Every structure is written in structure tokens, then in C-alpha cells.
Design a protein around this nucleic acid. Structure first.
Ligand SMILES: *[C@@H]1O[C@H](CO)[C@@H](O[C@@H]2O[C@H](CO)[C@@H](O)[C@H](O)[C@H]2NC(C)=O)[C@H](O)[C@H]1NC(C)=O
Ligand SMILES: *[C@@H]1O[C@H](CO)[C@@H](O[C@@H]2O[C@H](CO)[C@@H](O)[C@H](O)[C@H]2NC(C)=O)[C@H](O)[C@H]1NC(C)=O
Ligand SMILES: C=CCn1c(=O)n([C@@H]2O[C@H](CO)[C@@H](O)[C@H]2O)c2nc(N)[nH]c(=O)c21
Ligand SMILES: C=CCn1c(=O)n([C@@H]2O[C@H](CO)[C@@H](O)[C@H]2O)c2nc(N)[nH]c(=O)c21
Ligand SMILES: *[C@@H]1O[C@H](CO)[C@@H](O)[C@H](O)[C@H]1NC(C)=O
Ligand SMILES: *[C@@H]1O[C@H](CO)[C@@H](O)[C@H](O)[C@H]1NC(C)=O
Ligand SMILES: *[C@@H]1O[C@H](CO)[C@@H](O)[C@H](O)[C@H]1NC(C)=O
Ligand SMILES: *[C@@H]1O[C@H](CO)[C@@H](O)[C@H](O)[C@H]1NC(C)=O
Ligand SMILES: *[C@@H]1O[C@H](CO)[C@@H](O)[C@H](O)[C@H]1NC(C)=O
Ligand SMILES: *[C@@H]1O[C@H](CO)[C@@H](O)[C@H](O)[C@H]1NC(C)=O
Lengths: 762, 762
RNA sequence: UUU
RNA sequence: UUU
């Protein structure tokens, strides 16, 4: 480079994007390009905005000035904002091309004035604005999107009811989206402009809908009235219900004007009845969320479903009656109306026994993909019943009591300041009480692609006779179980098995004297991936694992340290006969060193090797000559103190060397000499002081995709003159260059960034 | 003190004990007291011993010079010993009073010569000495104890058979203890001096005992011949069996001379028969270890037990037949002979069903205390059977398959280089497959004091009707289960319950929508201690826990960070009504801060409080005024950067302040002013540079039991003059004062210990 | 850093 | 650091 970075911001270029997110700034920086279209300054501590702020920046279409002063309870309690953001007059009115402005999370007291007529989007979430006046909104003639939420709630209280003048929004003739969520609003702020497409009014104090409230809103596609007269039972937040357990009162004709309506969410409204009359003039409804109400009875009746032939998703989760364990699930025949239904969820209805007939109302739903009966405390269920449901993508019985955060969020859509479904048909029996299994349990289920048994009781000496019906099965998640690997024939029946997870089945590996057989993988002739993480495996009766197919083995969280104890050669070839193995994760095996033999004993095609988080205190680098196809080596989070004298005499194939979080204090004189194949190198979080040219030749350095250097101990004396220069001028990506690549001394420069460092005197 | 305090060694004083264990020394230090009786230099890197080594140290009775050069595979692989310890002539022969010498782990090639005639004990374990000659042993006329083991085994191989000359030990007329374990010895080194009391010959290549091998050893109390013709099945180390699965051959009359013999260990000898004839002349046998042999059949017969009326412990663990799941436990009636038996262990016999009668041979054993049938894969057992065994201290069924390292060590006695039994009768059902429970399961067991159900399947909504027979129960370990705390009546039946462990029952706390009732503790009117660690508790339907009795609550590894989320007051009194609570562990709750109300909401008698390992980034010290009985505060492993301006305006009662492992860079000007009650203060592993007198006044400092200062960033300039002086002269214990309390600068003194620092120039 |  |  002719001139160094200097600017503390990622200047991408598409549109000219300047991104100064979380750069510990107290002023907008100098040097921002004149052609800047989008400028982001979110999470900084810039205490004011003036006409100087954006003076030259005439082509700005977007300003993201979020979270420079987030409200006290929302922010960090180490770094509390002492004084609200100040916005002086005239700061925005120069900006003719400005289309989006984001001033959320700045403790603003009022809608900021003097905004340009070009503005289409204004976002003021998480401020202290709880009174909307018509006069304050006339600057927004041309506004289309308006976020006003999260200014009066339990985490950012205003201590009063929210106030919106009569007809405040009406003369916003182009307004499409309006969000007043999380605000302590008491009524729908009539009259609303008919142009509205989305209206978010959830988590508020609206006790009633008047029948003229949505009179003119023909174009409305999304309505959310959730959390008004909330159902408070086991709320993980402060929850005040409406008096007498009352519901949100919605006149039978309240929706008659909403012809175009695609999404209606009535989550947590304490509803007991879903009067069919609501939906008379709503033909095209696609999505209905009725979760967290009191509709256990209404689900038996449910006449309203007769008016919903277009409905793709219906949510009836968490409608149980308190203190009531129903013996079964009374589903309405009405459900058969729901011709278009792709997704149905009925978690938290709370019943003991599921029988095949209770689901009969759904048998003809042609488009049905997802049936979710999770978290129902179901104790009894003949799983063969799902023979009818071969066409379903997912059948979720997760969290039950079978044995042969989302619904409880306050605001799941809240914005920040910053799987095996793809294998085919899936039956999720996770987190259930299944202690024993046998073939009959899976009879008529030969269609299943993924079976999830994670988090059951299964404490069984699997012999190959247990999943015998499941010959289409590609994925078995057997994690968080108590597999007893006595027989090498475990899992051999699953002849189509591509992926097996036996992670966190440590129980029986923790006790001495117990025969385990890790050689069970010869039998599984299509197995691509095996996960046996966190099993505490320190003993094995067989001494090799063999497979012709296995590409990936995750072996983290075991005791290879015991198996490879110095002077015990028995297990040095444990992975040798995994002949296709490209990827081996042996991180967290409390390996303080590697005996000779470990690398010779690796399989031939090893591409990607993780020894992360072991406590490695030493490492013979020369032994990487045995791993002739090695491309990524992960030695992160260890106690290594030195790099090889010559990486090119260790491994000519290595592209990615991860050394972050070690105890390296310098580099060897010719470290990277000749390592032309190297592309990525992470030396971050070490204790390096100096780096000379001999170690980091330009030949090799300038071909790196990335070089990570942050969190070291750089000495910024005139001995550092080459490195400081090189960093300052190189094209090579070096993340955190303007935040965490800093000098620690000498004196003057202590704390100073290497990129700002001007060492004239040399 | 008049003089620092410069020797790098704990000078205890009883006998004058000088201990320089692990002090990174390369020479014996100067200044060792002339009256030194015991000197320890184990784990250092002192490369030789000379007549200078001990010149002045004339009263020495013991030298522990262990592990200054441990063998390559036994030692650290970062810091491998480059060259064996050298012992020059005349180094020991000045020491007239020397009685013990420990030169283990120094890579010595030969028994060191020139030793004094006063010497009673010589230890040479973990060296490279594998040939014993008579000539080399004549210096030891007066030796009583001789450790020669661990010079030829898989971890420290000599590559040949061990050699002992005929009659090598015979002219050691005072020899009592001789250890040749772990040595590749092929025969008992005859003839042995009759004076031998203990003889350790385990883990060797001894295929046969000749009948003259122990002819003259009337005084022998302990014999160990274990691991000779080892049973190699699931050995966690390299194990070579005798050919044809042969046993260690022991002539029927081999023990006839051993009249005094108290302990006989025949562990891992591949024995099939225990011929009664062995024990004909051994009256007083107290301890017999027959574990890891092939005695499944012999246990049915077992005629030899008839000759063992004095036997206190019998071990028959791990004798199962490979590939054989016995339907029951064929115990001999012979067992009834064992009148004196206190402890019996029969782990790893491997059977399916235990019935009450199989134990009938033991019914009259009056002195029986411990019956251990662990690790037997027992699937069925009526636990009421133990009605007969009310007099037993412990009944261990740990590691089984019931549902209504030790035996596998190489050398368990190997030396290093450095519970609820007390409640009464105990039934350990740990690590079993018990999924459901009910009252009948515990019928006739009302005698039990401690029940251990740790590590079962138990996934049940305990209602108070499950342990109803157990009214003497003082201790329930319910850990590593799946408690479902739906009912507040859980555990109320156990009216004598002093201690309850529901730790690591996180399963059902990890899923949303599930009602949990932490208020179950009101009912339990004698409960002293409750452990509910590692439960992931982030949701609770009740908002208080009440108890009149509870002294200790361990709540580590939960989510108080969610329960006390800023702006949610509901849980701020969660512990208030634990009225007798003296001790609260709320470490590992990922608490980045504490909201106001947390300390006002603590119970009145809180004495010690742990907030360790939370990520605390700040802390209002002034709110410790609410904890008027606080005595220990543990804020270790957090991100705190400052201490209070005045600890005495925060808490006048605090005795023990633990601040280790934080980010403190300086102290407040008057930190400890007036804090006369303070006794312990740990400031170790921070980033402190200077400490002035104003912060650490003498009147407060000199009353400390302990002050921890290591692993800081001390700047050793003339500004440090008071602190360097104070550290140098004080009586107050400061651990690691000569190892990890060091200057980091300026220049000259970088790395130097504060205690050696001479500041004349200031 | 003899397990 | 809007969950
Ligand atoms: C939502 O508005 C209500 C009232 O309209 C606020 O509740 C009042 O709070 C003040 C100060 O705490 C009390 O003195 C009053 O008793 C309350 N009035 C009524 C009528 O209930 C509430 O604080 C607002 N919510 C938030 C989160 O700010
Ligand atoms: C124990 O002694 C045997 C000799 O009985 C040693 O085994 C020899 O090892 C060398 C390796 O260099 C072989 O070439 C010999 O042929 C082996 N001989 C036999 C008879 O097995 C053994 O190494 C010794 N054990 C240890 C642990 O040092
Ligand atoms: C087969 C049922 C009981 N069983 C058993 O006899 N054995 C035998 O126990 C011994 C140790 O595993 C061996 O003889 C082995 O074959 C067992 N080993 C394991 N791991 N699990 C069992 O359920 C079990
Ligand atoms: C009691 C039998 C089934 N059951 C139940 O009805 N409930 C009810 O389900 C709802 C959620 O826990 C509540 O109404 C609760 O009372 C349950 N809650 C838990 N935690 N565990 C059960 O086994 C269970
Ligand atoms: C830039 O701004 C426009 C309008 O605000 C927006 O639609 C676009 O996605 C923004 N692009 C980026 C990368 O921020
Ligand atoms: C199985 O269920 C658990 C939830 O209990 C989930 O974490 C996991 O991703 C699921 N497994 C797969 C393969 O989808
Ligand atoms: C697995 O291991 C043992 C040898 O330790 C052997 O008995 C068994 O037959 C092997 N089986 C397979 C399927 O590889
Ligand atoms: C000191 O040495 C004697 C004799 O060698 C020994 O018996 C004694 O226990 C040792 N004491 C201590 C405190 O190490
Ligand atoms: C219960 O059993 C486990 C062994 O599985 C043990 O760790 C624990 O200490 C035992 N509990 C008590 C209270 O002794
Ligand atoms: C608190 O009590 C004592 C200090 O008196 C200490 O031994 C104990 O381990 C401490 N534990 C916790 C959890 O605070």
C-alpha cells in the first residue's frame, strides 16, 4: 500500500460501505470517504452528533448510529452510559439522499427533528420516547418504515402509559410498517393510514380492540397483537395479566376490513374461544399463531378452522389447562379443513397417551410437512402410528416421557446492537424416557431417514438386532445416552447409515473392568461421519478402528492421554485403518504431549487435524512429515512455546496453521522460509514481542489469505521497524488491526496501535 | 524479622526439617542450617552430588534427593533430563547419623557406593539398575529397608531379565523390607535373610515358586506375588501372560515356614485353584487378596476358607469367566468359616440375579462390615434381602444393571515424586439402571442411614410417597439423576434427612415450559445441607426457598444470571427465607454483574459466600453492609478491576477476602485502612504493579494469617521501597515467596524474586 | 516429574 | 450493549 489504513473501519465496496461497529470510538473518525453510501457506527461512545458529523458525506443513503448510549438496564453495567446522545440542530438536513436512519439505543427523549424528506426508514427502538405527537411526525411525510418499540417495558421503563395523539400516524400517507411493541400502549392508535402492510402492537397494555380499530386497513398483510392480556404461567419475565383472567377482547367483526391478511399472531392473549366469525372476510390467511392462550377446550371444538383452507402454519402450542393431565388429545375433525397446512404445532397441550386415531383428523392433509407434539408429557405411544405419515418431513415428539427458548421468550423478534432434516423424513424422540429398545418398536417405520434418540435413558448392550426395520436410515443421533459398547455388532443392521452420533455416552466408559469394542465401524459400509465426543474413553478391548468409508471422526473429550500413555504402544494405530479419514478431532484429550508413533499411526488421507485444548507443552514439528496430506492443523489453546525452525522441513502441504492461545514468545529465525503453500496463519493470543523479516519473508507473507496477530506483546522500538512498516502497508487481511494489535511498550507507546505508530526517529 | 528469609526452602522445625521440593534449583542452595536433620531436594535439576553437597550438614538423618533426573518416559516431555545424576566419591561417607537416603528417579546405572554404616533405608526406585551383585551390597551390612523396584518395566525398560546373584541379600542380617516390584525378575532371589518382614515381588516374570523359596522366613508378615502370570483381559497396560494361560505355580507346601504371615496378596496370578494345603501352617492370616484370577468355579468349592478363622479382609473381585454371564452367584458354605471377616469384596464375578439365599453363607459372620458386589452386571435384586444385614456398615452394589481405577491399576502402591459412610449403615445403588422407584422397593430397610442413588435413570415426579419406609435416613445422594421437581412435596417423607444431593439433575431444567418447585425445602425440618449444583436452573415457579434448618446450600453451575436478569425483581429473595443459612455457593452462574437487591435479599446469618467463576466485571462493594455476619467472600476467577476505596466502610466482619485471578492493576489509596478484622487476603494472579503503605497499613497487615501475592506484575523501582522492605521482613505467611513473587521490571531486575532484591541504591 |  |  502507498498509504496505511489509518481509518478504524472496514471499508467494503459494492454502494460504498464503511463499518465502524464496536471500535471504541468517542468521535466520528476523520478520513471517511466522500463517496460513503452506508456508514455504521453502532456500539461506540460518540456522545453527540452535529453538522460537522456528516459535513462532507453527501452521498449517504444509510446511517446506522445504534447503541452509543443504551439504556441503563439494557447496557453493560461495567460501562454504563453517563449522558444521553445529544443531537444538535441541522445535523441531518444536509443529507438529500438519506433513506435509512437508525438511532436505536441512545437514550433519546424525543423524536429527533430536522430530518430530510428523502427518509424512508427511521428506527428509534430502545430509546426513552413514550409520547407521540402529530407535529413531531410531519417531518416524516415520505416515511415507509417506523420502529418505535422498546421505549417503555420492564427493562426500559417509562413509568407511565404510552401516549399517541388521535390520528398521529394518519397523514403518513406512505407508511407501510409501524412497530409499537414493548411499549405500554393502552389502545390501537387510530386512525391508521390504509397503506399499512405490517402492524406490530405486541407486549403492551391493550385490553380491548374496538371494531373500528382496523376499518380502513385493506392492505395489511401482518398483524401482531400478542402479549396483551398475557398468559403469565411460568413466564420467565415480569408478567401482569388482565383482571379476572380476562382475555384480550376482540369484537367478532374486528378483522372484516383485513382482506389481504397473511399473518395473524395472537400469542399470549389469554384467549378461551376462537370465534369463527373473526375469519369470515379473511380468505388468504397463511399463518396463525395462537400459542400461550387457554384453548385446550377450544381445540376439541375449533369450528373456525372451517374458514382456513389457505393456512400454511397453525400454532396451538402451550394451551394446557393449569393442574390438568388430560388422558388423551381431543383434536377436532375441523382440522381436516386445513387443506393447505404444511406446519402444525401443538406443544404443551399436556396429555398421557397418544393413540393412532387421535391424529385421524390430519390423515388427508396432503401438504403436511411438520407435526410437532413436543413437551406434552406423553407417557405412552405406539410409534408405528406414524406409518400413515411417510410424506411428513418432521415428526417432533421432543421433550416427552415416552417409554416402551421460543414459546417462553418475551420478544423473540427483538433486534441486537450488532441438524438432520435435510436427510429426509425425521422422527425426533429426543429427551424422552426410552430405557430399552427392540425391532418391534420401529415396525412400519422403514421409511425414516433420520431418527433422533438423543437424551434418552438407553442403557443397553446393542447387538445389531434393535433397529432392524430401519433400512432407509441415513442418520442416527444416539447422543446423551448410555450406550454399552460390548458387541462390535452394535449398529450393523443400519446398512444405509451415513452419520452416527454416539457423543456424551460416557456413563459406562467411566467404570473399570468393562469391555468396550471400538471396532464396531467395519460393519458400517457407507458411514461418512462418526461423532463420539465427550465419552471419557480411556479403555478399549479392541486396538484398532477400521473403515473403508469414514471421512470424519470426532473424538473430542476422551482420554487418548491414557490410551497413549508413554511406553504403551498398543493404541498407536487406533485410527490407522480408518482408510478414507480426512478429518480427525482429537481436541480436549488432556494430551500434554504426543509420543512418537502417533503421527506415523494416522491414516494416509488426513487433511484436517485438531489437537486444540489439550495442554500440549511440547510438539515435535518434524514428525508432521508423516502427514503428507495435512492441510489444516489446529493447535489452538495449548502451552506450546516454540514454532518449528523451518515449517517447510515439517510439512510442505500445510495450508492452515492455527496456533492461537499458546505461550509463544518469539519465532525461530527462518520459521516460514520457503513455506509457499501456507495460506492462513493464526498466531493470535501469544506472547510474541518481535518479528523479523527472516522469519516472515515477504515471498510467503504476501500470499496469505489471512494473518492473525492480535493479543500479543509487541515491543514497539526501532528493532520493530520492519514489522511495523510491513503491517502498515500490506494488503493481507489482519483482523482487529485497529483495536487489538497494539504495542505494550516502550513507555511512550504503551497501549498504542501498531498501525497509528509513527516512528520517525529511526 | 531481623533477617530475611532468603533460602528457597520451607524450614519447618520439630528434628530440623528443610524442604526444597520443586524449587527449580540447579545446585544445593547455600545457607542450609547446620542443625538440618531431614533435607528434601526432590523435583529439582541439580545435576550432581559431591563432598561439598553436604559438607557442613553433620546431623543429617534423612536425605530425600528424588527425581532430579527421572527416566525419559516417566518424566516431563517439555523438560527431559539430559544426563544422569552424577555421584562423586566420598559424597555420603561423612554422614555418621544418616538413616534414610532416597535417590529414586535419577537414572542411576549402579547401586551407589561409599554409603555410611548408619544407613537403615535405601531407595532406588525408578533408576536404571537391573543387576544386583553381592559385592555392591556389602556396604549395607546394617540396612533394614531396601526399595529397588521400577527399574525394568514397560515405562522404564531395561530390555533384559533382571539379575540377582545367588544369596545376594543373605548377608544383610538386619534386612526387614525388600521390594523388587515392577522389575522383570524371573525367580525369588534365594537365599533370603530370615529377618524379612515384608517382601514385594509383584509385576515380574516369576513363573514358579520353588518349595525352598520361603524356607527360613518365619518373621515374614507381608508377601506380594501379584502380577506374575497376570490375567491380561482388559489390562490398561502392556500385559504378557504366562504360556497356555498357565498360573503362577505355587507348591502346596510353599508357605509352611510363614507362621507370622498377616497379608498375602495373590492378585493377577491366573490362579484356577486355591489348594487348602497352602494355609495349613498360616494361623494368623488377616488379609487375602485373590482378585484378577480365574476363580469363578473355585468360589463355589473354596475348601481353603475352612483354614481362615482369623481373616479380616478377603478380596475375590474380578474372577469372572470370559464370555460368561452366570445366572446367579454360587457362594460356598465354606464362607461361614470366616468368623473374623470384617470386609468381603466380590466385584466382577458377573451375574444376572441376586437372591437372598445366595448370601446365606454370610448370615452368621458376626464381625462383617463391608460386602461389595460392585460391577457384576446384576439385573435383578430384591433389595429387601438386606434386612438380614442391619449390622453391616456398607453394602455396595455400585456399577450394576439393577432396575425394578483400583482393580485394574498396574501398581496401586506406586510412589509419586512429591462420602456418607460416617452417617451409619449405607446402601450404595450408584450407577445402576433404576428408572422408577416406589415405597415397596425399600421395604424392611428402615435401618438405612445413607442411600446412594447417584447415577441412575430416575426420571420421576417425586411426590413424597417413594422412600416412605426410610425414617432413619440421614443422607440421600440423588445426584446424576433426572429429578423432575413438579411437586413441592418431593422428599418430605424422609423426616430424618440431614443432607440431600440433587446435583447434576439438569435434564428437565434444560427445556422450556416445565414447572419446577424449588420450595420443596420447607417440609424437611432437620435438613442441614442441600447440594443442587450443575442443574442449569434458569426457571422456577416458586420464587422463594424456605427453611428453618438449612445451614449450607450449594447452588453452583446454575443460571442465577437469568433468574436475576436486570429489571426482573421476582427472584431477588430466592434465598432470603433460608433462615439459618451460613454458607451459599453461587459460583459458576455466569453472573457478569449483581443487581441491587441481591445482598439485601440474602439471609441474615450468611457467613460465607462464593461468587467464584462468574465473569463478574463489576461489583458494588458498599452493599456488603447488608451481610453483617459475612466472614468469607470468594470472588476468585472473575474480571474485577478494582477493590473498594475502603473495605472497612463495606464490611467490618469480613475475615477472608479471596480476590485471586482477577484483573486488578492497582489498589485504592486507603483500601485496607481500619480493616482490623481481616485475617486472610488473596490477591494472587492479578496485574498489580505497586502497593503503597496507605493501602496496606502495618497495623492491619501484621495480623494476617496469610497474604497471597504471587503471579502479579510488580515494578521493582525505588517507588516499591516500602513494599519490598515489608515483604522481606514480615512474619506473615506469603506462599511461593521464593518462586512466584517476582519483579517484572525494570530492566535489571526482570524475573528477580522480590525477596532477593537489594535496594541499597534507593 | 515413579501413579 | 435492544434477546
Ligand atoms: C405502564 O404504565 C403504568 C400505568 O399506566 C405504569 O404503572 C404505574 O407506575 C407508577 C410508578 O411505578 C405507580 O406509582 C403507579 O401506581 C402505576 N399506575 C397504575 C395505574 O398502575 C407502569 O410503570 C408502566 N410500565 C413500565 C414498564 O414503565
Ligand atoms: C524383560 O526381559 C525380556 C527378556 O526375557 C526382554 O525381552 C527382550 O527384548 C528385546 C528387545 O530389544 C528382544 O530383541 C528380545 O528378543 C526379548 N527377549 C525375550 C525373551 O522376550 C524384555 O524387554 C524385558 N522387559 C522390559 C520391559 O524391559
Ligand atoms: C451381556 C450381559 C451382561 N454382561 C456381561 O456378562 N458382560 C461380560 O462382562 C465382562 C466385562 O465386560 C465380560 O465377560 C463381558 O463379556 C458384560 N459386559 C458389558 N460391557 N455389558 C454387559 O451388559 C455385560
Ligand atoms: C404429573 C404428570 C404429568 N405432568 C403434568 O401434567 N405436568 C403439568 O404440566 C404443566 C407444565 O409442567 C403443569 O400444568 C404441570 O402441573 C407436569 N409437569 C412436569 N414437570 N412433569 C410431569 O410429569 C407433568
Ligand atoms: C445500505 O442501505 C440500503 C438503504 O438503507 C439498504 O437497503 C442496504 O441493504 C444497505 N446495505 C448494507 C450492506 O448495509
Ligand atoms: C436431536 O435433538 C436435539 C434436541 O434434543 C438437538 O440438539 C439435535 O440437533 C437433534 N439432532 C439432529 C441430528 O437434528
Ligand atoms: C473386534 O475386536 C475383537 C479383538 O479385540 C475381536 O474379537 C472382534 O471379532 C472384532 N470384530 C470386528 C467386527 O471387527
Ligand atoms: C525424618 O527422617 C526420619 C529418619 O530418616 C524419618 O523416620 C522421619 O519420619 C522423617 N520426618 C519427617 C518429618 O520428614
Ligand atoms: C455415591 O456414589 C458415587 C460413586 O458412583 C460417589 O462418587 C459418591 O461419593 C457417593 N456418594 C456418597 C454420598 O458417598
Ligand atoms: C466456605 O466455608 C469455608 C470457609 O470458612 C470453606 O472451607 C468452604 O470451602 C467455603 N465454601 C463455599 C462454597 O463458600
Amino acid at each position: 500500500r502507498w498509504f496505511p489504513k489509518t481509518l478504524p473501519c472496514d471499508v467494503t465496496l459494492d454502494h460504498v460501505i464503511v463499518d465502524c461497529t464496536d471500535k471504541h470510538l468517542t468521535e466520528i473518525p476523520g478520513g471517511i470517504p466522500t463517496n460513503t453510501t452506508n456508514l455504521t457506527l453502532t456500539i461506540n461512545h460518540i456522545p453527540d452528533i452535529s453538522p460537522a458529523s456528516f459535513h462532507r458525506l453527501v452521498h449517504l443513503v444509510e446511517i446506522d448510529f445504534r447503541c452509543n448510549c443504551v439504556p441503563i438496564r439494557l447496557g453493560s453495567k461495567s460501562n454504563m452510559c453517563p449522558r444521553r446522545l445529544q443531537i444538535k440542530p441541522r445535523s441531518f438536513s444536509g443529507l438529500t439522499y438519506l433513506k435509512s436512519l437508525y438511532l436505536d439505543g441512545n437514550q433519546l427523549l424525543e423524536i429527533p427533528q430536522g430530518l430530510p424528506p428523502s427518509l424512508q426508514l427511521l428506527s428509534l427502538e430502545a430509546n426513552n420516547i413514550f409520547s407521540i405527537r402529530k407535529e413531531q411526525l410531519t417531518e416524516l411525510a415520505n416515511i415507509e418504515i417506523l420502529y418505535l418499540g422498546q421505549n417503555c417495558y420492564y427493562r426500559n421503563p417509562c413509568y407511565v402509559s404510552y401516549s399517541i395523539e388521535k390520528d398521529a400516524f394518519l397523514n403518513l400517507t406512505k407508511l407501510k410498517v409501524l412497530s409499537l411493541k414493548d411499549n405500554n400502549v393502552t389502545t390501537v392508535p387510530t386512525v391508521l393510514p390504509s397503506t399499512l402492510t405490517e402492524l406490530y402492537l405486541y407486549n403492551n397494555m391493550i385490553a380491548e380492540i374496538q371494531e373500528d380499530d382496523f376499518n380502513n386497513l385493506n392492505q395489511l398483510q401482518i398483524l401482531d397483537l400478542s402479549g396483551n392480556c398475557p398468559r403469565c404461567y411460568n413466564a420467565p419475565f415480569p408478567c401482569t395479566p388482565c383482571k379476572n383472567n380476562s382475555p384480550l377482547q376482540i369484537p367478532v367483526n374486528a378483522f372484516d376490513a383485513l382482506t389481504e391478511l397473511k399473518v395473524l399472531r395472537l400469542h399470549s392473549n389469554s384467549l378461551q374461544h376462537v370465534p369463527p366469525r373473526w375469519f369470515k372476510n379473511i380468505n388468504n390467511l397463511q399463518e396463525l399463531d395462537l400459542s400461550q392462550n387457554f384453548l385446550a377446550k377450544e381445540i376439541g371444538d375449533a369450528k373456525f378452522l372451517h374458514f382456513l383452507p389457505n393456512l400454511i402454519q397453525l400454532d396451538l402450542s402451550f394451551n394446557f389447562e393449569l393442574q390438568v393431565y388430560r388422558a388423551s388429545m381431543n383434536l377436532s375433525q375441523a382440522f381436516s379443513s386445513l387443506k393447505s397446512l404444511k406446519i402444525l404445532r401443538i406443544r404443551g397441550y399436556v396429555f398421557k397417551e397418544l393413540k393412532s386415531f387421535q391424529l385421524s383428523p390430519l390423515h388427508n392433509l396432503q401438504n403436511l410437512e411438520v407435526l410437532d407434539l413436543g413437551t406434552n408429557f406423553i407417557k405412552i405411544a405406539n410409534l408405528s402410528m406414524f406409518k400413515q405419515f411417510k410424506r411428513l418431513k418432521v415428526i417432533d415428539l421432543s421433550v416427552n416421557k415416552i417409554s416402551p427458548l421460543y414459546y417462553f421468550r418475551y420478544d423473540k423478534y427483538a433486534r441486537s446492537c450488532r441438524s438432520c432434516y435435510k436427510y429426509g423424513q425425521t422422527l425426533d424422540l429426543s429427551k424422552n424416557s426410552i430405557f430399552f429398545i427392540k425391532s418391534s418398536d420401529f415396525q412400519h417405520l422403514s421409511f425414516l431417514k433420520c431418527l433422533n434418540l438423543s437424551g434418552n435413558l438407553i442403557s443397553q448392550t446393542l447387538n445389531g438386532s434393535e433397529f432392524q426395520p430401519l433400512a432407509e436410515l441415513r442418520y442416527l443421533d444416539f447422543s446423551n445416552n448410555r450406550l454399552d459398547l460390548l458387541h462390535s455388532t452394535a449398529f450393523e443392521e443400519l446398512r444405509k447409515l451415513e452419520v452416527l452420533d454416539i457423543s456424551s455416552n460416557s456413563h459406562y466408559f467411566q467404570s473399570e473392568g468393562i469391555t468396550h469394542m471400538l471396532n464396531f465401524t467395519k460393519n458400517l459400509k457407507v458411514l461418512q461421519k462418526l461423532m463420539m465426543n465427550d465419552n471419557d474413553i480411556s479403555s478399549s478391548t479392541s486396538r484398532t478402528m477400521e473403515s473403508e468409508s469414514l471421512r470424519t471422526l470426532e473424538f473430542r473429550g476422551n482420554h487418548l492421554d491414557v490410551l497413549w500413555r508413554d511406553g504403551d504402544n498398543r493404541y498407536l494405530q487406533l485410527f490407522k485403518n480408518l482408510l478414507k479419514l480426512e478429518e480427525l478431532d482429537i481436541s480436549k484429550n488432556s494430551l500434554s504431549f504426543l509420543p512418537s508413533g502417533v503421527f506415523d499411526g494416522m491414516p494416509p488421507n488426513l487433511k484436517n487435524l485438531s489437537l486444540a485444548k489439550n495442554g500440549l507443552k511440547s510438539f515435535i514439528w518434524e514428525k508432521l512429515r508423516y502427514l503428507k496430506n495435512l492441510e489444516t492443523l489446529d493447535l489452538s489453546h495449548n502451552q506450546l512455546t516454540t514454532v518449528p525452525e523451518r515449517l517447510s522441513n515439517c510439512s510442505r502441504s500445510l495450508k492452515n496453521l492455527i496456533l492461537k492461545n499458546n505461550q509463544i514468545r518469539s519465532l525461530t529465525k527462518y520459521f516460514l522460509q520457503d513455506a509457499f503453500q501456507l495460506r492462513y496463519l493464526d498466531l493470535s493470543s501469544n506472547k510474541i514481542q518481535m518479528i523479523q523479516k527472516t522469519s516472515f519473508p515477504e515471498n510467503v507473507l504476501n500470499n496469505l489469505k489471512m494473518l492473525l496477530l492480535h493479543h500479543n506483546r509487541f515491543l514497539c522500538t526501532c528493532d520493530a521497524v520492519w514489522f511495523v512498516w510491513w503491517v502498515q502497508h500490506t494488503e493481507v487481511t489482519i483482523p482487529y488491526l485497529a483495536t487489538d494489535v497494539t504495542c505494550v511498550g516502550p513507555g511512550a507507546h504503551k497501549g498504542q496501535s501498531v498501525i497509528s505508530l509513527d516512528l520517525y526517529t529511526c
